[PDB]
Amino acid sequence: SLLISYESDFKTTLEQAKASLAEAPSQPLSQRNTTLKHVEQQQDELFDLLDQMDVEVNNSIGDASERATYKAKLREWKKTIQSDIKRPLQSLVDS
Amino acid sequence: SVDPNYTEMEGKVREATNNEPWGASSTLMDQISQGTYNFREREEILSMIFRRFTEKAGSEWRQIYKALQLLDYLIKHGSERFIDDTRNSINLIRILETFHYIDSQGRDQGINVRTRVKALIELLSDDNKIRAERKKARET
Amino acid sequence: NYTEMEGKVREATNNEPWGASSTLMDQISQGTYNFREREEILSMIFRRFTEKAGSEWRQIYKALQLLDYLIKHGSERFIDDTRNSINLIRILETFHYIDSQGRDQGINVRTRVKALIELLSDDNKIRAERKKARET
């Protein structure tokens, strides 16, 4: 399904950004800039994927109990992006 | 009487905004955009850019024009933090709205600065537009 | 004994590999941002225009390619230096060479040099090529 493909892209992207974030502080500045810039792009990609998934969840899933389950997951993912990507990235770019 | 001791990044911005008529290269601009992802380099990039707005005038207009080009590029390719820093200083950009210069042949050159400034201010006031422009920048 | 940067220019003009790496050319472009390397690149490229002739047309042709790339990607100071020596490039307009099989290879130089001069001698075209390199 499209949804599954979106979710797979999301999780893959989330893992990569977290790995880049953990690795960034130990890279030389020249390399660290490139790394943070890519993480910032991935942050934007992750938010866009939530929008996309929400649209797809709405169109493709008729089960009202199941649609609720997906919604909670999206909401938790949004919070994970904020806390595990956006906030640590901002902090690194700030110092 | 010390040397001004320009850093490498500061030298990059001086270069990207010198008085030559051909414009900063793609790769130079890209390199500057990378600098916006750490505190020191980004502070240096902001100061050098905004120094040109205040230190240059008249027949040195192309330096201002180039500083505006750099700034626009950085909105599209630099850090979100850099964009917020630039907003906080919109005032320093807005003063250039009435930049005027007529060259040694009658041609209006100040109009290049002015329209550039006008488009830059429009961009900065519109989060949705910035968002879309950064998307475009990545694809291309 | 050639400097490192001089070596890179020689490399970018070699018969082999026939396509130059944009990676090598980027290293040469970065060299145009400081006096020491810029002069070396400039003088290597113009020695090529002077010293090579006839059956060595490949090095002249690839030297012209490098120059074109550097105008588009390198420092504005390098462009100013190149234009100051535009007379030395114009000399190549008349480069003549017919090979072992009666084939005109000199034309590859003449055509290439005509385009570069058209570019180099027009500020608007240079600005547009530099921007377009960024729009990639």
**Radius of gyration of chain B, rounded?**
15 Å
**Tally of helical runs of chain B:** 8
CATH class of chain A reads Mainly Alpha
User: What's the structural domain tally of chain A?
Assistant: 1
What would you report as the Rg of chain A, rounded to the nearest angstrom? 15 Å
Q: Output the structural class of chain B.
A: mainly alpha
| CATH level 1 name of chain B | Mainly Alpha
Name given to the CATH homologous superfamily of chain A = t-snare proteins
Order of helices and strands of chain B: HHHHHHHH
The third-level CATH topology of chain A is: Methane Monooxygenase Hydroxylase, Chain G, domain 1
Percent strand of chain B? under 5%
PDB class: protein transport
Keywords: helix, enth, habc, recognition between SNARE and adaptor, protein transport
Assembly: trimeric
Entry title: yeast Ent3_ENTH-Vti1p_Habc complex structure
Summarize the structure in words:
Chain A: This is t-SNARE VTI1. The complex is a heterotrimer, with 1 copy of chain A (95 residues) and 2 copies of chain B. Chain A has 95 residues and is mainly alpha-helical. Chain A has a single domain (1-95), classed as Methane Monooxygenase Hydroxylase, Chain G, domain 1. Chain A has helices at residues 2-23, 29-60, 64-94. In chain A, helix 1 (2-23) runs antiparallel to helix 2 (29-60). Chain B has 140 residues and is mostly helical. Chain B has one domain (1-140): Serine Threonine Protein Phosphatase 5, Tetratricopeptide repeat, CATH 1.25.40. In chain B, helix 1 (8-16) packs parallel to helix 3 (39-55), helix 2 crosses helix 4 and helix 4 packs parallel to helix 7 (110-124). Chain B is globular. Chains in contact: A-B, B-C. At the B-C interface, helix 2 of B face helix 5 and helix 8 of C.
Topology:
The complex is a heterotrimer, with 1 copy of chain A (95 residues) and 2 copies of chain B.
Chain A: H1 2-23, H2 29-60, H3 64-94
Helix pairs in contact in A: 1-2, 1-3, 2-3
Chain B: H1 8-16, H2 26-35, H3 39-55, H4 61-77, H5 80-88, H6 90-94, H7 110-124, H8 127-139
Helix pairs in contact in B: 1-2, 1-3, 2-4, 3-4, 4-7
